Design a protein around this motif. Structure first.
Motif, PDB file in Angstrom:
ATOM      1  N   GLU A 186       0.863  -1.286  -0.098  1.00 26.31           N
ATOM      2  CA  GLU A 186       0.174  -0.059  -0.012  1.00 26.31           C
ATOM      3  C   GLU A 186       0.915   1.363   0.097  1.00 26.31           C
ATOM      4  O   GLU A 186       0.699   2.135  -0.839  1.00 26.31           O
ATOM      5  N   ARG A 187       1.983   1.346   0.821  1.00 24.15           N
ATOM      6  CA  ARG A 187       2.643   2.584   0.937  1.00 24.15           C
ATOM      7  C   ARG A 187       3.581   2.515  -0.350  1.00 24.15           C
ATOM      8  O   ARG A 187       3.774   3.746  -0.946  1.00 24.15           O
ATOM      9  N   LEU A 188       3.926   1.564  -0.790  1.00 19.15           N
ATOM     10  CA  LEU A 188       4.747   1.550  -1.836  1.00 19.15           C
ATOM     11  C   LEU A 188       4.000   2.000  -3.185  1.00 19.15           C
ATOM     12  O   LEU A 188       4.385   2.822  -4.080  1.00 19.15           O
ATOM     13  N   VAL A 189       2.747   1.650  -3.400  1.00 20.32           N
ATOM     14  CA  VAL A 189       2.136   2.032  -4.619  1.00 20.32           C
ATOM     15  C   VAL A 189       1.667   3.510  -4.486  1.00 20.32           C
ATOM     16  O   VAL A 189       1.243   4.082  -5.343  1.00 20.32           O
ATOM     17  N   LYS A 190       1.377   3.825  -2.994  1.00 20.39           N
ATOM     18  CA  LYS A 190       0.995   5.201  -2.841  1.00 20.39           C
ATOM     19  C   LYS A 190       2.093   6.058  -3.388  1.00 20.39           C
ATOM     20  O   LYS A 190       1.913   7.036  -4.327  1.00 20.39           O
ATOM     21  N   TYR A 191       3.397   6.012  -3.013  1.00 23.38           N
ATOM     22  CA  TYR A 191       4.395   6.786  -3.369  1.00 23.38           C
ATOM     23  C   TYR A 191       4.683   6.608  -5.038  1.00 23.38           C
ATOM     24  O   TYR A 191       5.169   7.708  -5.407  1.00 23.38           O
ATOM     25  N   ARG A 192       4.662   5.309  -5.685  1.00 18.65           N
ATOM     26  CA  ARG A 192       4.905   5.056  -7.110  1.00 18.65           C
ATOM     27  C   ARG A 192       3.968   5.795  -7.897  1.00 18.65           C
ATOM     28  O   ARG A 192       4.318   6.384  -8.804  1.00 18.65           O
TER      29      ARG A 192
ATOM     30  N   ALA B 265       2.362   8.685  -7.265  1.00 17.75           N
ATOM     31  CA  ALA B 265       2.620  10.061  -6.920  1.00 17.75           C
ATOM     32  C   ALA B 265       3.718  10.482  -7.761  1.00 17.75           C
ATOM     33  O   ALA B 265       3.825  11.531  -8.394  1.00 17.75           O
ATOM     34  N   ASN B 266       4.628   9.878  -7.676  1.00 18.98           N
ATOM     35  CA  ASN B 266       6.037   9.897  -8.761  1.00 18.98           C
ATOM     36  C   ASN B 266       5.579   9.761 -10.273  1.00 18.98           C
ATOM     37  O   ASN B 266       6.602  10.301 -10.824  1.00 18.98           O
ATOM     38  N   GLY B 267       5.101   9.051 -10.428  1.00 21.04           N
ATOM     39  CA  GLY B 267       4.643   8.887 -11.984  1.00 21.04           C
ATOM     40  C   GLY B 267       5.412   7.823 -12.392  1.00 21.04           C
ATOM     41  O   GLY B 267       5.496   7.122 -13.656  1.00 21.04           O
ATOM     42  N   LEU B 268       6.050   6.896 -11.226  1.00 19.84           N
ATOM     43  CA  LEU B 268       6.690   5.688 -11.716  1.00 19.84           C
ATOM     44  C   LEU B 268       5.963   4.536 -12.409  1.00 19.84           C
ATOM     45  O   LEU B 268       4.667   4.635 -11.704  1.00 19.84           O
ATOM     46  N   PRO B 269       6.506   3.872 -13.246  1.00 18.69           N
ATOM     47  CA  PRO B 269       5.420   2.826 -13.758  1.00 18.69           C
ATOM     48  C   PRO B 269       5.251   1.522 -12.938  1.00 18.69           C
ATOM     49  O   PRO B 269       5.921   0.397 -13.344  1.00 18.69           O
ATOM     50  N   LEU B 270       4.756   1.514 -11.591  1.00 22.30           N
ATOM     51  CA  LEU B 270       4.670   0.546 -10.894  1.00 22.30           C
ATOM     52  C   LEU B 270       5.732  -0.220 -10.598  1.00 22.30           C
ATOM     53  O   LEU B 270       6.744   0.156 -10.134  1.00 22.30           O
TER      54      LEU B 270
END
Ligand SMILES: CCCCCCCCCCCCCCCCCC(=O)OC[C@H](COP(=O)([O-])OCC(O)COP(=O)([O-])OC[C@@H](COC(=O)CCCCCCCCCCCCCCCCC)OC(=O)CCCCCCCCCCCCCCCCC)OC(=O)CCCCCCCCCCCCCCCCC
Ligand SMILES: CCCCCCCCCCCCCCCCCC(=O)OC[C@H](COP(=O)([O-])OCC(O)COP(=O)([O-])OC[C@@H](COC(=O)CCCCCCCCCCCCCCCCC)OC(=O)CCCCCCCCCCCCCCCCC)OC(=O)CCCCCCCCCCCCCCCCC
Ligand SMILES: CCCCCCCCCCCCCCCCC[C@@H](O)O[C@H](CO[C@H](O)CCCCCCCCCCCCCCC)COP(=O)(O)OCC[N+](C)(C)C
Ligand SMILES: CCCCCCCCCCCCCCCCC[C@@H](O)O[C@H](CO[C@H](O)CCCCCCCCCCCCCCC)COP(=O)(O)OCC[N+](C)(C)C
Ligand SMILES: CCCCCCCC/C=C/CCCCCCCC(=O)OC[C@H](COP(=O)(O)OCCN)OC(=O)CCCCCCC/C=C/CCCCCCCC
Ligand SMILES: CCCCCCCC/C=C\CCCCCCCC(=O)OC[C@H](COP(=O)(O)OCCN)OC(=O)CCCCCCC/C=C\CCCCCCCC
Ligand SMILES: Nc1ncnc2c1ncn2[C@@H]1O[C@H](COP(=O)(O)OP(=O)(O)O)[C@@H](O)[C@H]1O
Lengths: 107, 459, 54, 320, 347, 48, 42, 98, 140
Positions: free
Chosen positions: A76-82, A84-89
């Motif tokens: 959950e925390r990892l996807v929340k961060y990714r 936002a950054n626009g990183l591709p999962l």
């Protein structure tokens, strides 16, 4: 032929003995009624009362040593961060390529 | 791990120093307490393992098997209490001693950080079973059955010792942890092919494989009820545990190597399920059903995918419990009838309704009715096989159908219809037998609430 | 049930082994106790060893 | 110090105990003859030790308490049933014969042990020698089969090839009608049923085989009923004669040592009385054998070794 | 015989073995063998009968021929090198003849024929001594000259001994012949590891001697020399039958019993030297020894055979002579697997 | 009702001289119960 | 047969056991001290 | 290695083979053993004398003594065997069979 | 001795069929003669002529087995154009086994001979290829 037709001196095969005839309420445990009843009681108490109930409760409330809620919160925390950054999962490579040294072919 | 081993060892002096009419009571109580103690091991981690010491470790593949092995002993004692009634105190104490030694050997076998220790205990389990089969057996063919059971096992396992000592000479360690972290590919060579065969055939014979399954009907039919229970519930799973442990070193050779075994098992499950349809014996029918289930477990292990391993573990546990229950039911019938043939005593539902209910539940759980763990393993293995190849399902389909058939056949021949007129010594079922069936069946329906507890380390 | 399980699978591994071991045991153990034959065999193996292993 | 190689090495020599009075003697009489009376007077006059004729429970008299054990736990046969139904279906006749021969063998071993360990002579009734006459009579009357006599001959050869024959054999000779008359005068209802043919076969057997074979290796004193009444003449005949034709003069200290080690350890004495040859009259099944052995074990002073039985009253068990 | 004479003869046998073991001169080794041969003959004939005389003369013939071959090997070795010390053999087939002489002394195939006959002819105590003590000296010499042996010949005779023992034990109803074939197979197992590790040979010798002592003392206690004669033991001494069955299982090489320790180690050692096929074949052949041990166990304690009436009298008597070391022998031959690494003591 | 135990017929199989009797070995006989077998003075004419 | 507890053999057995235990304890103490002195621990 | 030693070893091999033939007459077995020890004595004596091993001159006498003692034992055994059968034929010792 | 082994092994597998057959026949004849000597020493059947007939029968049977082995294995290896393949030795080995069964005149013994000689020949070929040692020297 004076043979006795008996191969050997043998006890006759005894008939089966019923625990119910000499003792109603025989529980199928022992021929002695007191040992019978106490064996029934101890089997019932240490099997159904102690193991099946307390053990099932213990197994049900085992702590999360498999780390399932931990993994869920981490994801959950990892996807929340990714997001936002626009990183591709999740990345295709499990390890960063910059720290992997391939062998040059030169073929 | 000694918190389980030491009480099991103390079971022996307690039994031998027991009063002449208190052995069964003392043994059952302390066995149940030891089983409760064994429950602590179930709380596994998603990490490596529960490495207690250099000699013993625990795993979520080892923990369910250990719990089942501990739980089986009180049931075996309760089942054996009946037919050992006219027996001297010394020989009853010897019987209990043999059961305790078998449990101790199995417990040490399932932890076994090192492969040579595992082999030593794996073959140490052989002596108590052989003595139980050949000593407290009714028929005259118990000697031949014991010879078959001993020699099939030893012929399978003698190359395994040579392979293990060779592997330690080359690699340098037989420890499971070291082997897993330092595993290296095996080149496709003739020497490697024979090493693979030596590593695999010993566990293949005990499943047993369809080609090598002959010893099992003899051993199951001729052994007493405790012997049949321990053979069907735990001793067959030793081969599966050994394969799951030893297969890591085998890759990438397993793919080419697996075909003869995959075909043998996929056809032998059909063959044995079909054999079950035409049988004149309860014990032989249950033995052949066990052979079919373990052939499916062999297929699952050989496919070697995560879903395969979870299905194999679940199916092993479920089959152990179900087959022990089925043998107990057949023995309850035999102790009244003394014939051990299905077609003689009929219509037992009219005379024994609760025992007929137990028969129905046992046949349903052998039939793999959802959401029982039997079908959980069944479906996981079937899905893994389908991913392996879309044609396997057809064979699997046949198997399922055939299984159901003979299961209900065994339910219909003995429980439904008209009771034989001549038999009159069918007394009401005792509290001991009903308690035995309840203690067999309740763990299955409790485990179906928490399947992950028996799905192995790849969950 | 009968053709494969009761007969041929039984014929291959267990029965063949039993027959072969029985025949070998009968052949080896059937010695009449004549030291004449024993020592003739001893001479034969001595000369064979002198001719084969060097 | 129990007798063994160490005792023989240090001091124990039994040649010095012989004082020409040992003279093992066995007296044989036909049924209802007064062989016992003559033998007892011989033992009293010559200072020897008398051995009462071995019965069904003779072995019971030497082990544990002297009180005999149950018939099923000791012998599994009765002479009364043999007299009532000599052709019984269960083969009691040859079981009786075999048990009696084994008891006679044990009695001979005990007598030899006493003679070798003390030097005092012994007097015996029918021994393992001349015990075959009952076998022969039982066979001729049809009471037993030929396999029974073959088994008896095998056991008798294997056992009796290890012992020294008696120095003097004394026979009292009595007519058949006279012994029958003594049989009615005795008053035993079971003994009343003995037929004249059986006694004639038995009486005939002693003369035909026993006297001729023992005359070549022993010294025989054939006596009649009248002249056997006075034991003075009997003892005078015993003392006047000197034995020099038997195996006894050829024996020495080492042969006596071997014989004394043989007579001790009664288990090896009776070793060949249970040879694995299966005759239906004597073979016993596994279940009956197990049950009877368990019953014998549950006897008061038989579960453990003689000195280790708590219920009898043996104390200091934990320190023996 | 006279107990003093028997004690003197036993001491002479042991002194001959010790002279073989402690001497460094080939002539003294031959003299020790001669002394042992001379003092052994009356021991085999303690109970005088034609069977014992036949066994003794067969044994004397075989051992005298072996001694003559030993002397010829020694003299050829001296001819090709003026050495008397027991060291590397220094020569061709002189070593072959030395190996043949020692094999005939030990009873290895193809010189196995005399062991069953001599064991059957003699009594149980003489058989115990013959099968236990008479292996120390030739095995000591072989261990001393092990680096000289040609591995092909030694391994061939070892495999032959294992095969012949396994096959010949299957056909026996006499217990002494069973023990003789067991001895042949065990010697085959012993000599197959001499080219690689003499410590393993000595370990196998110790374990085999312990098991054989336990088995022979159990057979003497329940004085039976036949399978059916042994089948009557349960009706008197069931604990003896149980101990005998456990010992027989141990002699079969079953884990976790003590008899598993040598073969295991031997197999392990032979794998260090890149040898696989022979250890595999040896295990599969020892399966036959296990089979006839298991048949004896079936006839002994796992089933109850019919008994006889006179047996009841034997219930009333106890063994006057008791063997003190029997309890220890059983425990050592049954329950010493966990103490396996103690083999580093160079036993 | 009772566990099977060997009968006389079963016992007899192990009583031969050897296991697995054959035509050549059929005539062999077991050794005696004790290891002893049956054993199965000159004259001179001094004339003138 | 009819025998009393042989106090001679009992005394010899107890004395042998006690002597063996005492000698073993003394040997262990000396070995520990000698090892410490050789390796210079204390 | 000269021809005389080879001739002596051939003689020993012939004696051993004749011992292994067993036509009859166990007395001939003892004779073959004594021929073997005679060949051993001769060749050992030749080797020792040739190399001038002065202390080795002990060994042949010893050998002779011991071997002759063995012969005595063997002869005794033979007598007892004959004392049972009346003749020393090899085939009479057929009681013990493998 | 090992002279026959050197003679047989020196010839290439796919060439000189007759030479391989002759070497195999010689090895088989030697083996049959040794077996005949063992049988004669252990069991004198009736006389000299019967004994020599038995020795001749055994020797010729073994020689025929070896000859068929060599010729069939070499021919199969040559025609298949794939040398160093244990399958050729399997086929040749139980061609020899079938010839043994025909000589003894029993279908069951013929099939058993095919099984247990094809497997043995394949095993020997695998040992030659992979360097397996029947009598390993003491390495350590
Ligand atoms: C369904 C919901 C239930 C909720 C209430 C809770 C019920 C708990 C029951 C526990 C099981 C009973 C114990 C097992 C042995 C029997 C015990 C006994 O001795 O009874 C004597 C007692 C008195 O007998 P009597 O009158 O003296 O004797 C008369 C004769 O003996 C003649 O006897 P009889 O002919 O009357 O036989 C008794 C009766 C019943 O007896 C039995 O056969 C017991 C065994 C039935 C199942 C067989 C195994 C199949 C695998 C199912 C695994 C489910 C595990 C779930 C967790 C279980 C935890 C323990 O026969 C049947 O009804 C056969 C039922 C076949 C069911 C087929 C469908 C199965 C799957 C259904 C879905 C389950 C999950 C749903 C999930 C999704 C929705 C939530 O009779 C009963 O107690 C009958 C119980 C009622 C029937 C229950 C059937 C369904 C149970 C499924 C398991 C529990 C599911 C929980 C979630 C439900 C939502
Ligand atoms: C490790 C390697 C072990 C190798 C295998 C073991 C060899 C076993 C044979 C030992 C000698 C025979 C024997 O003791 O019988 C076996 C014995 C069973 O004895 P048995 O069958 O009841 O005795 C009947 C005798 O055959 C009947 O004999 P007897 O009652 O006529 O004998 C009289 C007795 C009594 O001796 C005396 O009276 C002493 C007289 C002194 C004369 C001084 C002459 C000086 C010149 O003398 C002996 O028993 C022999 C003493 C030899 C002492 C050597 C030191 O059990 C064992 O020896 C097992 C012992 C465990 C292995 C050796 C010790 C542990 C290591
Ligand atoms: C007679 C007619 C009926 C009368 C009774 C009517 C009442 C019916 C109710 C009974 C079952 C109906 C279904 C109701 C289910 C509710 C309980 C369930 O939710 O609990 C389960 C709990 O059950 C256990 O998980 C399974 C039982 C453990 C099984 C171990 C076996 C016992 C040991 C005995 C020896 C073992 C032998 C076999 C060896 C393997 C699942 O729990 P879980 O969703 O996860 O999370 C719990 C909450 N947490 C998050 C805080 C942890
Ligand atoms: C009886 C009940 C069941 C018991 C268990 C049965 C399961 C065990 C059977 C073993 C399976 C096969 C064993 C070897 C398989 C190797 C693959 C082979 O079959 O394929 C070809 C092999 O060709 C031929 O098969 C050569 C071998 C022929 C000889 C084998 C005997 C054939 C039938 C015997 C069956 C008897 C088994 C039981 C014995 C007691 C590939 O050609 P190639 O590229 O060159 O070799 C590749 C391997 N390399 C890389 C190591 C070289
Ligand atoms: C039914 C089971 C399947 C049987 C399949 C084949 C049956 C026919 C085989 C019969 C026995 C053959 C014995 C000889 C085989 C030789 C194999 C071999 O030596 O490989 C050893 C190999 C390499 O040898 P090295 O020389 O050290 O390597 C250096 C150069 N690379 O090393 C190893 O892997 C050692 C492992 C031992 C091999 C096992 C031998 C026995 C056969 C395998 C088991 C299969 C049979 C099982 C019986 C089933 C009964 C339930
Ligand atoms: C190289 C050699 C390898 C040898 C391998 C031996 C395997 C173990 C089995 C040995 C059995 C041989 C003896 C035998 O069978 O005797 C026949 C015997 C007759 O019974 P008896 O009680 O002896 O008396 C009968 C007359 N009254 O027949 C039987 O009873 C046999 C019953 C049990 C059969 C056991 C089957 C064992 C074989 C299974 C397969 C594995 C075999 C081992 C090698 C497998 C190859 C990888
Ligand atoms: N070998 C035997 N067989 C059968 N019965 C015997 C045998 N020996 C002794 N008896 C029995 O012993 C009994 C007592 O013996 P006997 O001398 O006649 O009487 P008593 O003891 O008064 O002198 C007799 O009734 C006789 O039958």
């Amino acid at each position: 032929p004076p043979e006795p037709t008996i191969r050997l001196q043998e006890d006759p095969d005894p008939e089966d003995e019923n625990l119910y005839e000499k003792n109603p309420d025989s529980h199928g445990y022992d021929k002695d009624p007191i040992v019978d009843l106490w064996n029934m009681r101890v089997v019932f108490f240490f099997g159904f009362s102690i193991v099946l109930v307390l053990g099932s409760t213990f197994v049900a409330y085992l702590p999360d040593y498999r780390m399932q809620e931990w993994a869920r919160r981490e994801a959950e925390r990892l996807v929340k961060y990714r997001e936002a950054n626009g990183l591709p999962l999740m990345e295709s490579n499990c390890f960063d390529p910059n720290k992997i040294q391939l062998p040059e072919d030169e073929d | 791990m000694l918190k389980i081993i030491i009480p099991t060892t103390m079971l022996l002096p307690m039994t031998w120093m027991s009063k002449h009419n208190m052995i069964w009571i003392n043994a059952t109580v302390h066995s149940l307490l030891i089983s409760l103690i064994s429950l602590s091991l179930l709380n596994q981690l998603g990490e490596n393992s529960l490495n207690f010491s250099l000699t013993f470790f625990s795993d979520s593949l080892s923990a369910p098997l250990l719990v089942l092995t501990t739980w089986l002993l009180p049931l075996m004692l309760m089942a054996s209490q009946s037919h050992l009634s006219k027996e001297t105190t010394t020989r009853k104490k010897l019987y209990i001693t043999m059961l305790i030694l078998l449990q101790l050997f199995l417990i040490m076998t399932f932890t076994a950080t090192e492969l040579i220790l595992f082999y030593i205990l794996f073959e140490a389990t052989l002596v108590p079973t052989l003595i139980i089969i050949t000593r407290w057996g009714n028929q005259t063919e118990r000697l031949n059955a014991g010879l078959y059971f001993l020699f099939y096992t030893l012929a399978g396992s003698l190359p395994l010792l040579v392979a293990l000592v060779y592997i330690q000479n080359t690699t340098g360690s037989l420890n499971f942890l070291i082997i897993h972290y330092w595993s290296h590919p095996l080149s496709n060579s003739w020497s490697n092919i024979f090493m693979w065969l030596a590593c695999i055939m010993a566990f293949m014979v005990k499943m047993p494989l369809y080609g090598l399954h002959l010893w099992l009907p003899k051993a199951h039919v001729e052994a007493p009820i405790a012997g049949s229970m321990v053979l069907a519930a735990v001793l067959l799973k030793l081969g599966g545990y050994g394969m799951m442990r030893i297969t890591t070193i085998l890759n990438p050779l397993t793919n080419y190597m697996a075909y003869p075994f995959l075909m043998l098992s996929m056809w032998g499950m059909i063959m044995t399920s079909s054999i079950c349809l035409r049988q004149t014996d309860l014990k032989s029918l249950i033995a052949y059903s066990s052979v079919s289930h373990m052939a499916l477990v062999i297929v699952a292990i050989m496919i070697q995918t995560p879903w395969s391993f979870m299905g194999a573990t679940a199916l092993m546990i479920a089959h152990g419990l179900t087959s022990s229950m089925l043998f107990c039911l057949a023995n309850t019938n035999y102790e009244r009838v003394h014939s051990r043939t299905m077609i003689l005593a009929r219509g037992l539902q009219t005379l024994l309704p609760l025992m007929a209910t137990w028969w129905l539940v046992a046949s349903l759980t052998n039939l793999a009715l959802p959401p029982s763990i039997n079908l959980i393993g069944e479906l996981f293995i079937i899905t893994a096989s389908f991913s392996w190849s879309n044609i396997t399902i057809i064979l699997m389909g046949m198997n399922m159908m055939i299984t159901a058939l003979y299961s209900l056949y065994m339910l219909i021949t003995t429980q439904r219809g008209k009771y034989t007129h001549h038999i009159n010594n069918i007394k009401p079922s005792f509290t001991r037998e009903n308690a035995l069936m309840a203690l067999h069946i309740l763990p299955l329906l409790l485990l179906t609430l928490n399947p992950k507890m028996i799905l192995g380390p790849l969950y | 049930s009968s053709l494969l399980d009761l007969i041929w699978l039984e014929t291959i591994l267990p029965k063949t082994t039993s027959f072969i071991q029985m025949k070998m045991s009968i052949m080896v153990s059937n010695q009449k106790g004549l030291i004449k034959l024993y020592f003739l065999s001893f001479l034969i193996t001595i000369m064979i060893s002198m001719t084969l292993f060097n | 110090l129990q007798y063994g190689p160490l005792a023989f090495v240090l001091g124990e020599r039994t040649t010095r105990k012989l004082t020409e009075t040992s003279k093992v003697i066995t007296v044989d009489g036909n049924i209802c003859s007064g062989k016992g009376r003559l033998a007892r007077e011989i033992a009293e006059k010559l200072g020897l030790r008398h051995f009462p004729e071995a019965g069904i429970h003779y072995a019971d008299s030497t082990t544990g308490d002297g009180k005999p054990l149950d018939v099923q736990l000791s012998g599994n046969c009765s002479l009364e049933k043999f007299y009532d139904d000599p052709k019984s279906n269960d083969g009691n006749s040859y079981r009786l014969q075999s048990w009696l021969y084994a008891s006679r063998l044990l009695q001979y071993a005990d007598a030899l042990e006493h003679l070798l360990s003390t030097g005092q002579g012994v007097v015996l009734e029918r021994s393992i020698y001349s015990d075959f006459v009952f076998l022969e009579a039982m066979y001729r009357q049809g009471f037993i089969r030929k396999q029974c006599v073959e088994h008896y001959n095998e056991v008798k050869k294997v056992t009796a090839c290890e012992y020294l024959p008696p120095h003097v054999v004394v026979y009292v000779d009595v007519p058949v009608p006279e012994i029958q008359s003594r049989i009615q005068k005795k008053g035993n209802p079971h003994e009343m049923k003995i037929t004249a043919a059986y006694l004639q076969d038995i009486e005939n057997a002693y003369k035909k085989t026993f006297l001729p074979e023992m005359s070549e290796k022993c010294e025989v004193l054939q006596y009649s009923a009248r002249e056997a009444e006075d034991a003075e003449k009997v003892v005078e005949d015993i003392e006047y004669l000197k034995c020099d034709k038997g195996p006894w003069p050829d024996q020495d200290d080492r042969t006596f040592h071997r014989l004394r080690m043989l007579v001790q350890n009664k288990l090896e004495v009776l070793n060949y009385t249970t040879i694995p040859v299966y005759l239906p009259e004597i073979t016993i099944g596994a279940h009956q054998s197990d049950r009877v052995f368990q019953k014998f074990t549950e006897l008061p002073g038989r579960k453990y070794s003689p000195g280790y039985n708590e219920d009898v009253g043996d104390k200091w068990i934990w320190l023996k | 015989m006279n107990p003093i004479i028997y004690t003197t003869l036993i001491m002479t046998v042991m002194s001959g073995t010790m002279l073989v073991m402690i001497s460094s001169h080939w002539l003294l080794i031959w003299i020790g063998f001669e002394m042992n041969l001379l003092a052994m003959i009356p021991v085999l004939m303690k109970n005088f009968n034609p069977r014992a005389t036949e066994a003794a003369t067969k044994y004397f013939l075989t051992q005298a021929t072996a001694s003559m071959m030993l002397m010829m090997a020694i003299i050829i070795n001296l001819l090709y090198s003026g050495q008397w010390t027991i060291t590397k053999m220094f020569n061709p087939v002189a070593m072959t003849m030395m190996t043949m002489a020692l094999a005939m002394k030990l009873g290895l195939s193809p010189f196995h024929f005399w062991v069953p006959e001599v064991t059957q002819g003699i009594s149980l105590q003489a058989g115990l001594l013959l099968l236990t003590w008479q292996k120390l000296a030739p095995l000591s010499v072989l261990c001393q000259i092990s680096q000289s042996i040609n591995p092909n010949l030694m391994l061939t005779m070892a495999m032959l001994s294992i095969l012949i023992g396994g096959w010949g034990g299957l056909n026996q109803t006499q217990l002494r012949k069973i023990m003789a074939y067991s001895s042949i197979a065990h010697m085959g197992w012993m000599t197959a590891v001499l080219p690689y590790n003499t410590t393993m040979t000595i370990l196998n010798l110790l374990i085999y001697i312990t098991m054989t002592l336990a088995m022979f003392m159990l057979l003497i206690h329940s004085s039976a020399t036949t399978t059916l004669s042994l089948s009557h033991t349960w009706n008197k001494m069931p604990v003896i039958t149980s101990l005998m069955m456990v010992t027989l299982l141990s002699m079969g090489g079953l884990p976790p019993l003590s008899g598993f320790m040598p073969k295991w180690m031997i197999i392990q050692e032979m794998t260090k030297n890149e040898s696989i096929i022979m250890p595999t074949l040896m295990a599969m052949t020892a399966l036959l020894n296990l089979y006839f041990y298991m048949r004896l166990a079936y006839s002994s304690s796992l089933t109850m055979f019919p008994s006889t009436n006179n047996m009841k009298m034997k219930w009333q008597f106890e063994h006057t002579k008791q063997m003190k070391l029997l309890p220890t022998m059983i425990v050592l031959s049954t329950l010493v697997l966990p103490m396996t690494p103690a083999l580093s003591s160079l036993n | 009702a009772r566990q099977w135990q060997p009968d006389v017929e079963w016992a007899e199989q192990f009583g031969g001289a050897v296991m697995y009797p054959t035509k050549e070995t059929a005539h062999w006989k077991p050794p005696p119960w004790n290891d002893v077998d049956p054993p199965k003075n000159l004259t001179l004419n001094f004339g003138p | 047969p009819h025998g009393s507890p042989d106090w001679l053999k009992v005394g010899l057995t107890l004395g042998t056991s006690v002597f063996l235990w005492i000698y073993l304890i003394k040997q262990h103490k000396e070995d520990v001290l000698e090892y410490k002195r050789r390796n210079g621990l204390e | 290695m000269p021809l005389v030693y080879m001739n002596i070893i051939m003689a020993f091999a012939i004696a051993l083979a004749g011992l292994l033939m067993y036509r009859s007459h166990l007395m001939s077995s003892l004779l073959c053993l004594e021929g073997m020890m005679l060949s051993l004595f001769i060749m050992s004596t030749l080797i020792i004398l040739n190399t001038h091993f002065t202390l080795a001159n002990m060994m042949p006498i010893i050998l002779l003594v011991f071997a002759a003692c063995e012969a005595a034992l063997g002869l005794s055994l033979l007598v007892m065997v004959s004392n049972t059968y009346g003749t020393d034929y090899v085939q009479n010792l057929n009681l013990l069979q493998c | 001795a090992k002279t026959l082994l050197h003679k047989y092994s020196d010839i290439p597998e796919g060439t000189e069929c007759h030479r391989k057959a002759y070497a195999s026949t010689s090895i088989g004849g030697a083996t049959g003669l040794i077996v005949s000597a063992y049988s004669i020493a252990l069991k004198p059947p009736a006389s000299f002529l019967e004994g020599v007939a038995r020795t001749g029968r055994y020797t010729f049977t073994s020689a025929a087995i070896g000859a068929i082995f060599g010729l069939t294995s070499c021919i199969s290896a040559q025609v298949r154009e794939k040398p160093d393949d244990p399958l050729n030795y399997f086929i040749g080995g139980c061609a020899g086994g079938l010839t043994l069964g025909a000589r003894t005149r029993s279908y069951g013994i013929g099939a058993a001979a095919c099984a247990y000689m094809g497997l043995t020949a394949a095993l020997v070929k695998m040992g030659q290829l992979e360097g397996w040692q029947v009598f390993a020297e003491p390495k350590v």
